[PDB]
Design a protein around this ligand. Sequence first.
Ligand SMILES: CNc1nc2ccc(S(=O)(=O)N(CC(C)C)C[C@@H](O)[C@H](Cc3ccccc3)NC(=O)O[C@H]3CO[C@H]4OC[C@H](OCCC(F)(F)F)[C@H]43)cc2o1
Ligand SMILES: [Cl-]
Ligand SMILES: [Cl-]
Ligand SMILES: [Cl-]
Lengths: 99, 99
Amino acid sequence: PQITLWQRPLVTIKIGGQLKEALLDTGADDTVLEEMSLPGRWKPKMIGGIGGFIKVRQYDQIPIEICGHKAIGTVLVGPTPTNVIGRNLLTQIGCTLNF
Amino acid sequence: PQITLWQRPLVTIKIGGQLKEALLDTGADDTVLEEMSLPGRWKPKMIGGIGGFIKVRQYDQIPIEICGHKAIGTVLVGPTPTNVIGRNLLTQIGCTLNF
Ligand SMILES: CNc1nc2ccc(S(=O)(=O)N(CC(C)C)C[C@@H](O)[C@H](Cc3ccccc3)NC(=O)O[C@H]3CO[C@H]4OC[C@H](OCCC(F)(F)F)[C@H]43)cc2o1
Ligand SMILES: [Cl-]
Ligand SMILES: [Cl-]
Ligand SMILES: [Cl-]
């Protein structure tokens, strides 16, 4: 698809058996989601943005689907004010900026 | 251009006759630059991100070139960790997301 930027680029993702809404975020290195359970190992991480840092749990090798597009990657979980899909997964679905 | 997302989508901008580096950021409604001088009067704004909120100065109708593409619009100035070009200007230069 070609996604306009007149509005926030929100999509539905499928992760950990749940459907969630998230922002396609080229300014985010990493994918960060609000609190949720995920299986497998994790390690603590601090990530920083406008306003400072938050502590998150880093889960690796997590399957996700974004717009029919399957991928696998790292998902950070913690008290983000909004769910963001970062570059680590945007690359896997072949997402580019165009102008 | 078509810009992939394996690295940060950093581009050169020009504002007030000076070159700066900034991130093309589809997750940002607005454009926020690190401390700098701009002309005219400013208005207050609070913008929120991953770690909370910051206060910025809002300047309107500012000419800014992004990857050579000419825009004139609102620029917020304050203690952001990185210069970000948000959707207010990405739409002026005809930017879309594609996959
Ligand atoms: C109302 N209008 C309004 N206009 C706005 C304009 C902007 C913002 S915004 O910036 O809050 N943000 C909103 C979004 C999160 C919904 C945009 C987002 O793309 C942000 C951009 C950025 C990139 C780099 C640093 C800081 C911010 N990315 C981000 O947070 O990424 C995190 C997860 O991945 C890492 O990589 C990048 C960053 O690294 C942190 C490194 C350090 F710790 F800062 F050094 C880490 C809100 C605005 O509100
Ligand atoms: Cl990853
Ligand atoms: Cl590619
Ligand atoms: Cl604007």
